[PDB]
């Protein structure tokens, strides 16, 4: 039972890494668009995707809390 | 101990929660700056802060993987 929870937790932590990396990429793009100028629509589109990723990152935190509690309760 | 490693994981997750909370807060501000207009400097300043928070979230993932590796053994 320990191993199965750990495998799921490890997947979740990998996902956290990947989402943070993607978020960094989008923020880099936003900085470029702001620096060289762009349409308001172009900025809003990046902000929308950035918002989605941050919401996904929040979800992972709740998952990981649950999985760590499972490991604690064994 | 398993107990002490779990406590470290609990700490790291609390830190992750707080960063996520702050990150949403700053993004709301960023949306305001774009919506209501602002100096380029104000936007760049906020983006610098947001970038730092995201780097910490990535750092915490690596810390948490390290702690889980300890827990497995």
Please tell me what resolution, in angstroms, this structure has.
1.5
In chain A, what are the domain boundaries? Answer: 2-72
Q: How many whole angstroms separate alpha carbon A36 and alpha carbon A57?
A: 29
C-beta neighbour count of B28 within 10 angstroms = 10
Q: How many whole angstroms separate alpha carbon B68 and alpha carbon B36?
A: 45
Tell me how the structure was determined: X-ray
- Broken C–N links (> 2.5 Å) in chain A, after residues: none
Q: Counting beta carbons within 10 angstroms of the beta carbon of residue A68, is it exposed (0 to 12), middle (13 to 18) or buried (19 or more)?
A: buried
Residue A20's nearest CA partner among B64, B20, B68 is B20
**B54/A27 touch (CB, cutoff 8 Å), yes or no:** yes
* Residues recorded for chain A: 74
Work out how many CB contacts closer than 8 A connect A with B: 76
Pure H helices in A1-74: 2-36, 40-72
- Residue A39 has what DSSP assignment? -
Q: Which residues of A touch B (CB under 8 A)?
A: 6, 9-10, 13-14, 16-17, 20-21, 23-24, 27, 30-31, 34, 40, 43-44, 47, 50-51, 54, 57-58, 61, 64-65, 68, 71-72
- SS3 at position A70: helix
């Amino acid at each position: 039972t320990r191993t199965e929870i750990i495998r799921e937790l490890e997947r979740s932590l990998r996902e956290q890494e990947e989402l943070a990396k993607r978020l960094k990429e989008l923020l880099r793009e936003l900085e470029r668009l702001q620096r060289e100028g762009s349409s308001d629509e172009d900025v809003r589109e990046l902000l929308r995707e950035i918002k989605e990723l941050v919401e996904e990152i929040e979800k992972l935190a709740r998952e990981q809390k649950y999985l760590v509690e499972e490991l604690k309760r064994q």
